[PDB]
Amino acid sequence: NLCPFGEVFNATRFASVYAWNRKRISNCVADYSVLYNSASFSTFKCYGVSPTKLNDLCFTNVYADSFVIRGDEVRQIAPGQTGKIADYNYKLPDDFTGCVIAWNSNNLDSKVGGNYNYLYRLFRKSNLKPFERDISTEIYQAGSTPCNGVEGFNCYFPLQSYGFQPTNGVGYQPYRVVVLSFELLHAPATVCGP
Amino acid sequence: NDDELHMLMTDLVYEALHFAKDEEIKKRVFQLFELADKAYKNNDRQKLEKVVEELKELLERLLS
Ligand SMILES: *[C@@H]1O[C@H](CO[C@@H]2O[C@@H](C)[C@@H](O)[C@@H](O)[C@@H]2O)[C@@H](O[C@@H]2O[C@H](CO)[C@@H](O)[C@H](O)[C@H]2NC(C)=O)[C@H](O)[C@H]1NC(C)=O
C-alpha cells in the first residue's frame, strides 16, 4: 500500500492559492527519496526535519497542501514570513514542521493567451490564522461607508487573478507548491517510510 | 508585459498598504488601485504603467 503522492504532485489541476487543497495522507508507505532526488524541483525546504532523514521517520499524519503561486512569492511559503500570500492566503505557523516543495510549472499552467484561472486574495480585514482557508467572496470594506455587497468606490472584490502567460520572466512564472505538514504526536504512526 | 505589470501593481499596493501608517496614505493607494484595475480590464497599457510609477514613488517615500 503506497501513499498517493501521485495524486498530489502529478495532479491534473492545482488549486488556487486563496483556496488551497488539503490532501490527507495516512495508512500507507511514504517513499520520500523520489521527491528529494527528483531533480525537477527548484525548492525543497524542510523545517524541523532534515530532507535526507525523512525515510527514517514515522508520522501520525501527513498533509499535502497544494496550490499555485507566482515565482517571487515562493519565498513566502515558510514559517515566520509575511507578505500578501503569507498573510492572506496561506499562513504557516512559526513552529511549522514539514517540507515545502515547489517547481516551475510554466509548461503546464500557462496558455498562449494567458491562464487567468488562478486566484489569490489581495484584500482582507485581518491576517490569517495558521492553516486557515478563507474562501469568502464578500466585498472588501476599504472605506467607512458600508459596501453592501456591491463593488465600487472603496469596495473591492477581494480576489485577483494571476495573468500567467508563457513569455513571462522568472519572477512571474507559475510554481506548483506542495507543502507536506508532518504530525509527530504520540500515535499509531500510520504513515511512514519503506 | 501587461500581465507582469498588473502583478507588479498588486505587489506595490500590498506593500503600500502595509506601511500606510497614515489613513491618508491608504486613501491614495486605494484610489490608485481603482485606476489600475480599470486600465487593466480595458487593456490601457499607458495608464496602467502610470499608476505603477506613482505607486513606486509612493512606496519609496514610505520605506526611506
Ligand atoms: C510524477 O510523474 C512522473 C512522470 O509521469 C508518469 O510517467 C509518464 C511516462 C506517464 O506515464 C505519466 O502519465 C505518468 O504519470 C514520474 O516520473 C517517472 O518516474 C519513474 C520511476 O522512477 C521513472 O522510471 C520515469 O522515467 C519517470 N518519468 C518522467 C517523465 O520523469 C514521477 O515519479 C511522478 N511523481 C510522483 C510523486 O508520482
Residue numbers in the entry:
A (entry chain B): 334 to 527
B (entry chain A): 1 to 64
What does the original paper state about this entry?
Severe acute respiratory syndrome coronavirus 2 (SARS-CoV-2) is decorated with spikes, and viral entry into cells is initiated when these spikes bind to the host angiotensin-converting enzyme 2 (ACE2) receptor. Cao et al. designed small, stable proteins that bind tightly to the spike and block it from binding to ACE2. We set out to design high-affinity protein minibinders to the SARS-CoV-2 spike receptor binding domain (RBD) that compete with ACE2 binding. Unlike antibodies, the miniproteins do not require expression in mammalian cells, and their small size and high stability may allow formulation for direct delivery to the nasal or respiratory system.
The best designs bind with very high affinity and prevent SARS-CoV-2 infection of mammalian Vero E6 cells. Cryo–electron microscopy shows that the structures of the two most potent inhibitors are nearly identical to the computational models. The very close agreement of the cryo-EM structures of LCB1 and LCB3 with the computational design models suggest that the main challenges to overcome are not in the de novo design of proteins with shape and chemical complementarity to the target surface, but in recognizing the best candidates and identifying a small number of affinity-increasing substitutions. The large amount of data collected in protein-interface design experiments such as those described here should inform the improvement of the detailed atomic models at the core of Rosetta design calculations, as well as complementary machine-learning approaches, to enable even faster in silico design of picomolar inhibitors such as LCB1 and LCB3.
